[PDB]
Amino acid sequence: SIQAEEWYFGKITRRESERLLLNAENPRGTFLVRESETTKGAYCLSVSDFDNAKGLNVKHYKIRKLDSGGFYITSRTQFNSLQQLVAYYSKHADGLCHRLTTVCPT
Ligand SMILES: O=P(O)(O)Oc1ccccc1
Ligand SMILES: O=P(O)(O)Oc1ccccc1
């Protein structure tokens, strides 16, 4: 189950995810998965980043799930589980701000 998963923060707001991710100690790619505030049935992958122009900041990526069974941020790249999606993005940056590195601390 995903609610067992340490990176699944479940029902928390976008504002709260940003409060948690905007810690000067979080390296780029620090992340968590929460419920989407605006899309029913969807999740949201929240990720920290850092660069010389913007400093420490946060990105949000909607995760769709089909009753057909797939999970995805982009339909071009789907997975059989949310856990497999997290595993994949921890290895490949693709179009994200940075590959997933470490679970956001509480
Ligand atoms: O509104 P949500 O809770 O899905 O969060 C966002 C915000 C911006 C981009 C993707 C998702
Ligand atoms: O340029 P942004 O601040 O949107 O961050 C990135 C960097 C590369 C890909 C996606 C996001």
From Swiss-Prot:
Expressed ubiquitously. Expressed in the skin (at protein level). Platelets, neurons and osteoclasts express 5-fold to 200-fold higher levels than most other tissues. The phosphorylated form is termed pp60c-src. S-nitrosylation is important for activation of its kinase activity. Residues 7-104 form the SH2 domain. It comes from the Eukaryota. The modification Phosphotyrosine is found at Y43. It is found in: Cell membrane; Mitochondrion inner membrane; Nucleus; Cytoplasm, Cytoskeleton. Coiled coil: none annotated. Part of a complex comprised of PTPRA, BCAR1, BCAR3 (via SH2 domain) and SRC; the formation of the complex is dependent on integrin mediated-tyrosine phosphorylation of PTPRA. Interacts with DDEF1/ASAP1; via the SH3 domain. Interacts with CCPG1. Identified in a complex containing FGFR4, NCAM1, CDH2, PLCG1, FRS2, SRC, SHC1, GAP43 and CTTN. Interacts with ERBB2, STAT1 and PNN. Interacts with DDR1, DDR2 and DAB2. Interacts with CDCP1, TGFB1I1 and TOM1L2. Interacts with the cytoplasmic domain of MUC1, phosphorylates it and increases binding of MUC1 with beta-catenin. The SH2 and SH3 domains are important for the intramolecular and intermolecular interactions that regulate catalytic activity, localization, and substrate recruitment. It is linked to SRC kinase activity has been shown to be increased in several tumor tissues and tumor cell lines such as colon carcinoma cells. May be involved in blister formation in Pemphigus vulgaris, phosphorylated-SRC is abundant at blister sites but not in normally adherent tissue, which corresponds with loss and disruption of CDH1 in cells adjacent to blisters. Phosphorylated SRC is increasingly abundant at pre-lesional sites of blister formation and occurs prior to changes in abundance of CDH1 and DSG3. Belongs to the protein kinase superfamily. Tyr protein kinase family. SRC subfamily. Non-receptor protein tyrosine kinase which is activated following engagement of many different classes of cellular receptors including immune response receptors, integrins and other adhesion receptors, receptor protein tyrosine kinases, G protein-coupled receptors as well as cytokine receptors. Participates in signaling pathways that control a diverse spectrum of biological activities including gene transcription, immune response, cell adhesion, cell cycle progression, apoptosis, migration, and transformation. This is Proto-oncogene tyrosine-protein kinase Src. It comes from Homo sapiens. The lineage of its organism: Eukaryota, Metazoa, Chordata, Craniata, Vertebrata. The chain holds residues 145 to 250 of 536 of the full protein.
